[PDB]
């Protein structure tokens, strides 16, 4: 007949004109099924529906050059981490992926080893070093170590374009024959995700804080290897067990050593990445 | 301790700081549960995730004074009809609700009975008439009949702000003691929902058309009665069995009679509304 509540799912899915084995049909069949199930499960009202419409609208409207509020929504509802988890499984011993987040920027300067990526000098100086190897234990020559962090104010460069220098706490480093990287930066600082839009509103309404534990992002790539999209977390950070975006993994926690002794930098963090074929 | 695929839902929901019985917690618990189930069900890829982010973003960004693309998305996935369905359980004999759609505009001119709502004179003239009553059969005095339709070009006034006169095919009528309404308009025309944004892209990808059968919208309100948000459909419209927004109900299909004899209007359509509660 016409639409009924009991046949809502079949009614909507049955309008599709594409073959059932087309990937879009498989995805959309499940999306509609789950969406209808949700609405029925909690009895979404007309007013609640209107709230949702308004929220989704504002979420897209606040997106633009320096802000991806839909990524933040995905991130804070654990969707991003879940997508990473089911797609980027790897053997024991290989460094684990985690949530990408929205603040990677392609085409960062290719810098020299030992260069200082902290261009505004805000934070405590830190020496970052380690080795890229394959799963069989061999250093990889010509791996690209693409790194990004916030500054001491809790912001990535792209969040404060007219304040932070371009490429602040960003750089790309290409390993030599020994697989080693080394650069100077600052010790990362815990930061709230942008909380002045819908995502911040929702966290507030759920009695959730917006913070992530301090971390340095590493995107490590090499010919013939799976792309490693990860971060290292500052050991001891108070938010390690309450990351707003669910990104922490035990093995990604990095030690930070205080350097009275080597006063080139105040801190050092050593961390080795292991890629798979 | 940390996020795992198999504990993804508990991990995310467990961060809520509000009481389990708070409406936001009930809704969001189910939203996260269903959203994670969906992602797992069909194995959303990183690329698919990225496509969704972009799509949701564009959907919100194209919203504005004259277009609610999130409503259209809700409508075309059957969510709007479903929310209307589960929030109404009216008695036998009361006129049924259906999908609101995005084109109602508050504060339409209060017109006299017999006034013509068709200001651009595009379409075949039609006389619309009927009676508002209660379930016991008594006319309702002082009901407001708030009506809106497209013009012959298949657009609501707000979709062509520089072309259509303001309030074209819109008006509010207040019933007298006999409960009767009467106005002149045009016979409505089948129309595609706006198909140049994400929603149109999606329908195209699913091999679905963007069309609705011809209809006149009626929002009927009265003191002490449930708000009636409905439409009447043009009998015999070839899209009655394939409404893009699933809004058709048998009882809302209206008969249209041709008037050779009184060529004041070409057509007349008589339809009574029965309010409840
Ligand atoms: C294509 C389909 C599109 C439509 C699909 C429908 C989806 C429905 C799911 C969302 C429904 C959630 C809303 C539940 C409302 C009740 C509890 C939460 C908020 C609530 O209390 O509502 C209001 C306040 O909310 C606030 O101030 C903050 C709430 C923020 C908005 C609600 C959450 C948005 C939904 C998240 C997006 C969906 C995820 C994307 C995949 C006012 O009520 P009150 O009781 O506080 O007032 C009394 C004070 N005097
Ligand atoms: C919290 C945020 C969550 C973040 C998102 C994660 C959730 C996963 C959602 C995944 C949806 C992807 C499904 C699309 C199928 C793609 C695979 C088929 C092959 C292909 O490339 O087709 C594209 C289809 O994508 C398209 O048509 C573009 C994608 C459109 C799908 C998005 C619909 C989402 C519904 C939102 C409801 C709100 C829920 C609130 C609780 C072509 O591209 P094309 O078709 O454009 O080109 C043609 C113009 N006809
Ligand atoms: Fe980050
Ligand atoms: Fe309409």
CSV table of C-alpha atoms in Angstrom, one decimal, chain A residues 2-5 8 11-13 15-18 22-46 48-49 53-54 56-64 68 70-71 74-83 85-89 97 100 202 204-208 227 240-250 253, chain B residues 1-5 8 11-13 15-18 22-46 48-49 53-54 56-61 63-64 68 70-71 74-88 97 202 204-209 227 240-250 253:
chain,number,residue,atom,x,y,z
A,2,UNK,CA,1.5,3.4,1.1
A,3,UNK,CA,4.1,4.1,3.8
A,4,UNK,CA,3.5,2.4,7.2
A,5,UNK,CA,5.5,2.5,10.3
A,8,UNK,CA,9.0,2.0,6.8
A,11,UNK,CA,9.2,1.1,1.7
A,12,UNK,CA,12.2,3.5,1.5
A,13,UNK,CA,14.7,0.9,0.5
A,15,UNK,CA,12.4,2.8,-4.1
A,16,UNK,CA,16.1,2.3,-5.0
A,17,UNK,CA,16.4,1.5,-8.7
A,18,UNK,CA,20.0,0.2,-8.5
A,22,UNK,CA,25.7,-2.2,-5.9
A,23,UNK,CA,27.8,-0.9,-2.9
A,24,UNK,CA,25.7,2.3,-2.6
A,25,UNK,CA,22.6,0.1,-2.2
A,26,UNK,CA,24.2,-2.1,0.5
A,27,UNK,CA,25.4,1.0,2.4
A,28,UNK,CA,22.1,3.0,2.0
A,29,UNK,CA,19.9,-0.1,2.8
A,30,UNK,CA,21.7,-0.4,6.2
A,31,UNK,CA,21.8,3.4,6.8
A,32,UNK,CA,18.0,3.7,6.4
A,33,UNK,CA,17.4,0.5,8.4
A,34,UNK,CA,19.5,1.8,11.3
A,35,UNK,CA,18.1,5.4,11.1
A,36,UNK,CA,14.5,4.1,11.2
A,37,UNK,CA,15.4,1.7,14.0
A,38,UNK,CA,16.9,4.6,16.0
A,39,UNK,CA,13.9,6.9,15.5
A,40,UNK,CA,11.4,4.1,16.6
A,41,UNK,CA,13.6,2.9,19.5
A,42,UNK,CA,13.6,6.2,21.4
A,43,UNK,CA,10.5,7.8,19.8
A,44,UNK,CA,12.0,10.9,18.4
A,45,UNK,CA,9.4,13.7,18.6
A,46,UNK,CA,8.7,16.4,16.0
A,48,UNK,CA,13.5,16.7,18.7
A,49,UNK,CA,13.6,16.1,15.0
A,53,UNK,CA,17.8,19.4,11.7
A,54,UNK,CA,19.0,22.7,13.1
A,56,UNK,CA,23.2,19.3,11.6
A,57,UNK,CA,22.6,22.4,9.6
A,58,UNK,CA,24.7,24.6,11.9
A,59,UNK,CA,27.4,21.9,12.0
A,60,UNK,CA,27.8,22.1,8.2
A,61,UNK,CA,27.5,25.9,8.2
A,62,UNK,CA,30.4,26.4,10.6
A,63,UNK,CA,32.6,24.2,8.5
A,64,UNK,CA,35.2,26.0,6.3
A,68,UNK,CA,35.7,20.7,10.1
A,70,UNK,CA,31.5,17.3,11.0
A,71,UNK,CA,34.9,15.6,11.6
A,74,UNK,CA,32.5,12.0,14.0
A,75,UNK,CA,35.5,12.2,16.3
A,76,UNK,CA,33.6,12.9,19.5
A,77,UNK,CA,31.0,10.2,18.9
A,78,UNK,CA,33.8,7.6,18.4
A,79,UNK,CA,32.9,7.1,14.7
A,80,UNK,CA,36.3,8.2,13.5
A,81,UNK,CA,38.2,5.9,15.8
A,82,UNK,CA,35.8,3.0,14.9
A,83,UNK,CA,36.4,3.5,11.1
A,85,UNK,CA,39.9,0.4,13.8
A,86,UNK,CA,38.0,-1.7,11.3
A,87,UNK,CA,40.0,-0.5,8.2
A,88,UNK,CA,43.6,-0.3,9.4
A,89,UNK,CA,44.2,-3.5,11.3
A,97,UNK,CA,47.0,3.8,13.6
A,100,UNK,CA,43.4,11.3,12.2
A,202,UNK,CA,26.5,18.6,22.5
A,204,UNK,CA,28.2,20.3,27.3
A,205,UNK,CA,24.7,18.8,27.2
A,206,UNK,CA,26.1,15.3,27.8
A,207,UNK,CA,28.3,16.5,30.7
A,208,UNK,CA,31.4,15.6,28.7
A,227,UNK,CA,50.5,4.5,5.5
A,240,UNK,CA,44.9,9.7,28.9
A,241,UNK,CA,41.8,7.8,30.2
A,242,UNK,CA,39.3,10.4,29.0
A,243,UNK,CA,40.2,11.5,25.5
A,244,UNK,CA,37.3,13.3,24.0
A,245,UNK,CA,37.9,11.5,20.7
A,246,UNK,CA,38.8,8.0,22.0
A,247,UNK,CA,42.2,8.0,20.3
A,248,UNK,CA,44.6,6.7,23.0
A,249,UNK,CA,46.3,3.3,22.7
A,250,UNK,CA,48.7,2.1,25.4
A,253,UNK,CA,52.1,6.5,25.0
B,1,UNK,CA,40.9,0.5,29.6
B,2,UNK,CA,40.8,2.0,26.0
B,3,UNK,CA,38.6,2.0,23.0
B,4,UNK,CA,38.1,-1.3,21.2
B,5,UNK,CA,35.9,-2.2,18.3
B,8,UNK,CA,33.0,0.9,20.9
B,11,UNK,CA,33.2,3.3,25.5
B,12,UNK,CA,31.5,6.3,23.9
B,13,UNK,CA,28.3,6.2,25.9
B,15,UNK,CA,31.7,9.1,28.8
B,16,UNK,CA,28.3,10.8,29.4
B,17,UNK,CA,28.3,12.7,32.7
B,18,UNK,CA,24.5,13.1,32.8
B,22,UNK,CA,17.9,12.2,31.1
B,23,UNK,CA,16.3,12.4,27.7
B,24,UNK,CA,19.6,13.5,26.0
B,25,UNK,CA,21.3,10.4,27.5
B,26,UNK,CA,18.5,8.0,26.3
B,27,UNK,CA,18.5,9.5,22.8
B,28,UNK,CA,22.3,9.7,22.4
B,29,UNK,CA,22.8,6.1,23.9
B,30,UNK,CA,20.6,4.8,21.1
B,31,UNK,CA,22.1,7.1,18.4
B,32,UNK,CA,25.6,6.0,19.2
B,33,UNK,CA,24.5,2.3,19.4
B,34,UNK,CA,22.8,2.5,16.0
B,35,UNK,CA,25.5,4.6,14.3
B,36,UNK,CA,28.3,2.2,15.4
B,37,UNK,CA,26.1,-0.9,14.4
B,38,UNK,CA,25.7,0.7,11.0
B,39,UNK,CA,29.4,1.4,10.5
B,40,UNK,CA,30.2,-2.2,11.5
B,41,UNK,CA,27.3,-3.7,9.5
B,42,UNK,CA,28.6,-2.5,6.1
B,43,UNK,CA,32.2,-1.9,6.9
B,44,UNK,CA,32.4,1.8,6.1
B,45,UNK,CA,35.8,2.5,4.5
B,46,UNK,CA,38.0,5.5,5.1
B,48,UNK,CA,33.3,6.3,2.3
B,49,UNK,CA,33.6,8.1,5.6
B,53,UNK,CA,31.8,14.1,5.8
B,54,UNK,CA,31.9,16.0,2.6
B,56,UNK,CA,26.9,16.2,5.2
B,57,UNK,CA,29.0,19.4,5.1
B,58,UNK,CA,27.7,20.4,1.7
B,59,UNK,CA,24.1,19.6,2.8
B,60,UNK,CA,24.3,22.1,5.7
B,61,UNK,CA,26.2,24.7,3.6
B,63,UNK,CA,20.8,25.5,3.5
B,64,UNK,CA,19.6,29.1,3.6
B,68,UNK,CA,16.4,23.4,3.8
B,70,UNK,CA,18.7,18.7,5.6
B,71,UNK,CA,14.8,18.6,5.7
B,74,UNK,CA,15.1,13.6,6.1
B,75,UNK,CA,12.1,13.7,3.8
B,76,UNK,CA,13.6,11.6,1.0
B,77,UNK,CA,15.0,8.9,3.4
B,78,UNK,CA,11.5,8.5,5.0
B,79,UNK,CA,12.6,9.9,8.3
B,80,UNK,CA,10.2,12.8,8.2
B,81,UNK,CA,7.2,10.7,7.4
B,82,UNK,CA,8.3,8.2,10.1
B,83,UNK,CA,8.5,10.9,12.8
B,84,UNK,CA,5.1,12.2,11.8
B,85,UNK,CA,3.7,8.6,11.9
B,86,UNK,CA,4.9,7.6,15.3
B,87,UNK,CA,3.9,10.9,17.0
B,88,UNK,CA,0.2,10.7,15.9
B,97,UNK,CA,-1.4,14.2,9.3
B,202,UNK,CA,22.0,10.9,-3.7
B,204,UNK,CA,20.4,10.0,-8.8
B,205,UNK,CA,23.0,7.6,-7.4
B,206,UNK,CA,20.3,5.4,-6.0
B,207,UNK,CA,18.3,5.5,-9.3
B,208,UNK,CA,15.4,7.3,-7.7
B,209,UNK,CA,13.4,10.2,-9.1
B,227,UNK,CA,-2.8,20.8,15.0
B,240,UNK,CA,0.9,8.9,-6.2
B,241,UNK,CA,2.6,5.5,-6.0
B,242,UNK,CA,6.2,6.8,-6.0
B,243,UNK,CA,6.2,10.0,-3.8
B,244,UNK,CA,9.9,10.8,-3.2
B,245,UNK,CA,9.0,11.7,0.4
B,246,UNK,CA,6.5,8.9,1.1
B,247,UNK,CA,3.8,11.3,2.1
B,248,UNK,CA,0.7,9.9,0.3
B,249,UNK,CA,-2.2,8.5,2.3
B,250,UNK,CA,-5.3,7.2,0.5
B,253,UNK,CA,-6.3,12.0,-2.2
